[PDB]
């Protein structure tokens, strides 16, 4: 996937946007834009509202101004984005016709949603037990284990939906960069992995601090608090609220605290093993390829739909992969998630990935593994034998917050 | 501001209030503020704020709350960055400790008046019988921002009725590379789009 970032960063054309004008600059020293078409287009949350085509005429090292026709001013809520692409109409000795040589995108506007969810004719029905809490609403049912404090299962009809409970996750299956040259025999104490390990990140134990349920006028409310500890030290604290309304949506809210003296964690999110397994993956966010915090300029914000298989990156030596950031809506099966996060989805648990040395040895697991991150550390790469992730990409804030919405169709 | 919603609910151990407002202007919605107030049997009020900012509006100077307290005290005591006025892009010299000063010291008599006296990275703030807790920045004086904003010389300010208090979850940098162009660096602009903060208020 990296190749793409490269291609993008190396493009020969550079754009500037000013009002309705696009400024184009040529990084060619000798040629003229003689096989160049500029396609542009506007969309609202993925919905295309206008497209255009304009032939480029730029001298090496020159500028070209591009005047935009009056732009649409949708009422509807959402993000308005502009995207340009450069195309090579005619083939070349090294390229096919219709080749894309450059692109760039901008966010034009935003229409914040001020609407309210219409009333529901009913409200979830809570049900205590010793072991748990039961929330029911129609065919839908959710259960939270009282000992663990997690959402243990959920049904649609008589169908269980998870093979694994929904939980906080703070680590990742180490990247090559996370490892560097650390070896079992000869460990490198500064490697991220090494530190994480030593800190017990990989093996901290969660502890329920609190778990409560409450009935509100329009929904049911659950609250939890856990602590991950290791050898007496508390690494993290996770406080959540789950709120299920009469519309059948579950809103999740997460607030985490990280000990300042622990190594910044690879990530901050949740995960679970879904019982279902589908064909496609559809999302509204950065795509379509794998992208990370410190490697995503080449990605575009749009609506993507791919086959599950494509959501996996077959790095010969396996590790965390396939992430997509800046996601607002994710759809898989009957499920839908909403918010602002990054995620990955495949048939391999991080543990598997982490424990397997060659790609050829992985075997798909039972359902679908899903990781939803509120935040994720950068990947680095300045070199692969020292820590190369820049500070701006480390999860060093100490406190993190994120929210999410889960539903079915 | 426009009330979008306001509700109350009784929980087993506390009372819960929730609100949602929208600030608009000429049909455009600039911000959205969603809160929860939760008062328990211990008499503490926990506040939770989540804001959304239109990506196409100019980054706001700050994100917080304010009010005019009826009381007026002598000292100010806090646990955070001090003791002098400090801002996001101007605070390396400040220290994290417990500070106690006289109200007067919480004001910066810039000849030409403006926002001032802020202290960041605060975890606990005490004034009178009150106490606030969380992670914020604040300022406290006898002058409303409006006054400051409307007065050209320091000598013309007059203390207002009680004590004005501004508690910020976030605050923009002040800049200074030059004073005749925008000099605040990007790292100091409130450009995230979404902000969250929490607070705790009580009395002694």
From Swiss-Prot, chain B:
It comes from the Bacteria. Induction: By allolactose. Substrate binds at residue 180. The record marks 180 as: Important for ensuring that an appropriate proportion of lactose is converted to allolactose. Homotetramer. Belongs to the glycosyl hydrolase 2 family. This is Beta-galactosidase. It comes from Escherichia coli (strain K12).
């Amino acid at each position: 996937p990296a190749l793409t970032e490269a291609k993008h960063q190396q493009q020969f054309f550079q754009f500037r946007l000013s009002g309705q004008t696009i400024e184009v600059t040529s990084e060619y020293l000798f040629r003229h834009s003689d096989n160049e078409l500029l396609h542009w287009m506007v969309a609202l949350d993925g919905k295309p509202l206008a497209s255009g085509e304009v032939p480029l005429d730029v001298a090496p090292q020159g500028k070209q101004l591009i005047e935009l026709p009056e732009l649409p001013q949708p009422e509807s809520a959402g993000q308005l984005w502009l995207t340009v692409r450069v195309v090579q109409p005619n083939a070349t000795a090294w390229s096919e016709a219709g080749h894309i040589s450059a692109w760039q995108q901008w966010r034009l506007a935003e229409n914040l949603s001020v609407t309210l969810p219409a009333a529901s004719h009913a409200i979830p029905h809570l049900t205590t037990s010793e072991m748990d809490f039961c929330i029911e609403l129609g065919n839908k049912r959710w259960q939270f284990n009282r000992q663990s404090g997690f959402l243990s299962q959920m049904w649609i009809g008589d169908k269980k939906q998870l093979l694994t409970p929904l939980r906080d996750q703070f680590t990742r299956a180490p990247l090559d960069n996370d490892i560097g040259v650390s070896e079992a025999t000869r460990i490198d104490p500064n490697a991220w992995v090494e530190r994480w390990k030593a800190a017990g990140h990989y093996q901290a134990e969660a502890a329920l601090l609190q778990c409560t349920a409450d009935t509100l006028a329009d929904a049911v409310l659950i609250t939890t608090a856990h602590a991950w500890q290791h050898q007496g030290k508390t690494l993290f604290i996770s406080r959540k609220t789950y709120r299920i309304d009469g519309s059948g949506q579950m809103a999740i809210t997460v607030d985490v605290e990280v000990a300042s003296d622990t190594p910044h964690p690879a990530r901050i999110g949740l995960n679970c093993q879904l019982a279902q397994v589908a064909e496609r993956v559809n999302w509204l966010g950065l795509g379509p390829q794998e992208n990370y915090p410190d490697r995503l300029t080449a990605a575009c914000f749009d609506r993507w739909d791919l086959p599950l298989s494509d959501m996996y990156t077959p790095y010969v030596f396996p590790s965390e992969n396939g992430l997509r950031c800046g996601t607002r809506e994710l759809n898989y099966g009957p499920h839908q998630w909403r918010g602002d996060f990054q995620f990955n989805i495949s048939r391999y648990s991080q543990q598997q990935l982490m424990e397997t040395s060659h790609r050829h040895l992985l075997h798909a697991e039972e359902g679908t593994w899903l990781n939803i991150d509120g935040f994720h550390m950068g990947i680095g790469g300045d070199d692969s034998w020292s820590p190369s992730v820049s500070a701006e990409f480390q999860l060093s804030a100490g406190r993190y917050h994120y929210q999410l919405v889960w539903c079915q169709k």
